[PDB]
């Protein structure tokens, strides 16, 4: 089916999720995505500096984002979504996307900022 499953897993091993530091953290993230029957995978960041906070999945029907691992909200609406990102395999980084609908090509995103627990 249509999934960015290998693309997020390729963005996993490069720069985003682990060097040697978060190597116990990534082994949970591999264990989450293999059991996940959801197709579209979404990466939540804190800022545009590519600081990982949560890994989400798109249902497609209700257009919400559910948490499998990480620190963040339980559900995320597209109103909560401020900006969306795209990972380039060749450039090995996340590139910003202009304003559009939530599509399968969206590999990563960010939120408004007020939604964090103060």
């Amino acid at each position: 089916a249509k999934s960015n499953k290998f693309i997020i897993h390729n963005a996993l091993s490069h720069c985003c999720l682990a060097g040697k530091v978060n190597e116990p953290q990534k082994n949970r993230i591999l264990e989450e995505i293999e059991k996940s029957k959801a197709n579209h995978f979404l990466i939540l960041f804190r800022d545009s500096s590519c600081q990982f906070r949560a890994l989400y999945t798109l249902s497609g029907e209700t257009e919400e984002l559910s948490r499998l691992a990480g620190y963040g909200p339980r559900t995320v609406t597209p109103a909560m979504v401020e900006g969306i990102y795209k990972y380039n395999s060749d450039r090995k980084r996340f590139t910003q996307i202009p304003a559009k609908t939530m599509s399968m090509s969206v590999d990563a995103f960010t939120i408004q900022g007020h939604l964090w627990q103060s």
């Binding site: 693309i7 390729n10 395999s89 060749d90 090995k92």
Partner: protein, 426 residues
């Protein structure tokens, strides 16, 4: 939209040694990398192939891979290695000695980790990648075995780019080792799963082209590969140089591949003639398409009249009129529609480059897909069956730590592959 040509083995390093020899001569460039051509066509599309240094110096974006320096030494000690940087000069010691399990599994894996870093060195210098090119043989231990570990990791790295390798099918007349069909079987077992497309190259077929059609007396490896590199350069420069039918190779890979495992191509070159027939033959497009359809102009020893054409690519070079192009393309389709698959009305993709090559005013390049490629694969399979029984010199690979059911599964993939051509043959 740039290409990296990772060359491997004794063969594919020497094969690609003739290639960039053409490419620098294609664009009129000094052996040190200085441009001396007079065309903006030779000036604008340098980016796809070369990295410009300070003071008009062009770095060939191509990697020489071997576990022995000696092939790269002869490139370096010879001409046109002076354009190459020592970062392209990566080797270990010693060689695998044409051994797959030494190259792919034990010894070459350490050097590839240094090679793939240099790939990461070049790809970060690359602004926009289009795909990666490879060149080796099927019976090459350091050529294919290292390359099978290359493409498996590059596909893990870059699932999006054009993955093509240029592999040489082992000739029944040309043999140096007996475990050469072991290496070709273990290649295709991973090359199907890891590559997007490839070509089939038979030196025995290239022997006939030089001798029966070109009337050449002493074919050397470079003279054979000069025939190859002209067909190599005929494909991708059409993506680079302008044309009316600007056909991407990725456009080609959609149009040539109906099943994602059936991606094997039959190359051909249309303006093949001897030196005496230069005064005996005029240059027309129906002269070329006749020599496109010729079984004696195929670079792989397979019968195009026995099997049936899956897909056909018509790579064209020159200032041709489309009416001469389209009708003569249709005339071949009117002639040998029985040699086609039934369920496609146009089994021929036309690809016209307006920019002519040097010397000849017009040129063309045949790329075909047929079900008769399995004929060379049955040469591989049946020779594998006898050798799997007696297991002669298998202790070379057994001490490396390989399993026989892995080899049977590799045979099973070859058992799958021959059956898949019979699906679309009839």
């Amino acid at each position: 939209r740039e290409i990296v040509h990772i060359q491997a083995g004794q063969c594919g390093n020497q094969i690609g040694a003739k290639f960039w020899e053409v490419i620098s001569d294609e664009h009129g460039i000094d052996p040190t990398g200085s441009y001396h051509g007079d065309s903006d066509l030779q000036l604008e599309r340098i980016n796809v192939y070369y990295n410009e240094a300070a003071g008009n110096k062009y770095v060939p974006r191509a990697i020489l891979v071997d576990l022995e320096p000696g092939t790269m030494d002869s490139v370096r000690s010879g001409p046109f290695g002076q354009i190459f940087r020592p970062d392209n000069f990566v080797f270990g010691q010693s060689g695998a000695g044409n051994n797959w399990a030494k190259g792919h599994y034990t010894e070459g894996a350490e050097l590839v980790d240094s090679v793939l870093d240099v790939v990461r060195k070049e790809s970060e210098s690359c602004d926009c990648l289009q795909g990666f090119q490879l060149t080796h043989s099927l019976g090459g231990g350091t050529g294919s075995g290292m390359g099978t570990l290359l493409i498996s990791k590059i596909r893990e790295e870059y699932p999006d780019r054009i993955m093509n390798t240029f592999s040489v099918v082992p000739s029944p007349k040309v043999s140096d080792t007996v475990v050469e069909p072991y290496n070709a079987t273990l290649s295709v077992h991973q090359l199907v799963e890891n590559t997007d497309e490839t070509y089939c190259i038979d030196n025995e077929a290239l022997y006939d082209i030089c001798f029966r059609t070109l009337k050449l007396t002493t074919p050397t490896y470079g003279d054979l590969n000069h025939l190859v590199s002209a067909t190599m350069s005929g494909v991708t420069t059409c993506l680079r140089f302008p044309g009316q039918l600007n056909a991407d190779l990725r456009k080609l890979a959609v149009n040539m591949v109906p099943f994602p495992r059936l991606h094997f191509f039959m190359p051909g070159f249309a303006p093949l003639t001897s030196r005496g027939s230069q005064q005996y033959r005029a240059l027309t497009v129906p002269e070329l398409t006749q020599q496109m359809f010729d079984a004696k102009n195929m670079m792989a020893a397979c019968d195009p009249r026995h099997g049936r054409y899956l897909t056909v690519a018509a790579v064209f070079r020159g200032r041709m009129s489309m009416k001469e192009v389209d009708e003569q393309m249709l005339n071949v389709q009117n002639k040998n529609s029985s040699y086609f698959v039934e369920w496609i009305p146009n089994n021929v993709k036309t690809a016209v480059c307006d920019i002519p090559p040097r010397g000849l005013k017009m040129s063309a390049t045949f790329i075909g897909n047929s079900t008769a490629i399995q004929e060379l694969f049955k040469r591989i399979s049946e020779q594998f069956t006898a050798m799997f029984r007696r297991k002669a010199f298998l202790h070379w690979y057994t001490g490396e730590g390989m399993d026989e059911m892995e080899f049977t599964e590799a045979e099973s993939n070859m058992n799958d592959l021959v059956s898949e051509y019979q699906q679309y043959q009839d």
